[PDB]
């Protein structure tokens, strides 16, 4: 790896700098290097990993959707399809890289609920991004891989975390989006969002002012989706 000669601490420091500079491809490369040092990641480090790849894949997904729409309109030369394929291939490569980091070896070394749920949610997320562009023989298996990762994360989070935990809430939010637009299960999506919102509501009284702000921020995303979906 091109980051093999840099100290772990310097990679983390430079990831934080790259975030401030909005250099998210650099940020992701630095955090990939940090993961490849082989040590477990702290809470803050896990968030840096997540933010970096979310921004990288988010730009690719937004581009793919623009190109796919143009391509669709043009089917109502080969250049549109070719360029959509180029972006799609690059996106799949990013998802494969993230999934490879989780499988080698973040998940197997993650014993605490906060770390294991975080990584299993990420695994579901990046299989979901693969499913957004999937069309061939393996699409159903891609979908089931996302479902399986989300489900294991949900099972742990329900046993080990309070209903206001922000990781638990963000997991439920994304699993509900999975149901709605990947699995064609809008009723499951709505039920999960509502149950998650209501159980978090009833737990807010246990929280500090800061935790309350953290949880209600994500609850608002659940509510906004319910308003869009109902």
């Amino acid at each position: 790896g091109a980051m093999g000669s840099m100290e772990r601490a310097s990679l983390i420091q430079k990831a934080k700098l790259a975030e401030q500079a909005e250099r998210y491809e650099d940020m992701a490369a630095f955090m990939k290097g940090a993961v490849e040092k082989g040590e477990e990641l702290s809470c803050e480090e896990r968030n840096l990993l997540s933010v970096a790849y979310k921004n990288v894949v988010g730009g690719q997904r937004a581009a793919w959707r623009v190109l796919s729409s143009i391509e669709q309109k043009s089917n109502e030369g080969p250049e549109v399809r070719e360029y959509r394929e180029k972006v799609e291939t690059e996106l799949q490569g990013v998802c494969d890289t993230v999934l490879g980091l989780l499988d080698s070896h973040l998940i197997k070394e993650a014993g605490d609920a906060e770390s294991r749920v975080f990584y299993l949610k990420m695994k579901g997320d990046y299989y979901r991004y693969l499913a957004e562009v999937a069309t061939g023989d393996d699409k159903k298996r891609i979908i089931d891989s996302a479902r399986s990762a989300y489900q294991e994360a949900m099972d742990i989070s329900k046993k080990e975390m309070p209903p206001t935990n922000p990781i638990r809430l963000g997991l439920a939010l994304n699993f509900s989006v999975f149901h709605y637009e990947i699995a064609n299960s809008p009723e499951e999506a709505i039920s999960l969002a509502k149950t998650t919102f209501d159980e978090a509501m009833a737990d807010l009284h246990t929280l500090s002012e800061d935790s309350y702000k953290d949880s209600t921020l994500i609850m608002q995303l659940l509510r906004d989706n319910l308003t869009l979906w109902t």
Binding site: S50, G58, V177
Partner: peptide, 7 residues
């Protein structure tokens, strides 16, 4: 557009 956690 619906929200996911990262957004």
């Amino acid at each position: 557009r619906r929200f996911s956690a990262g957004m």
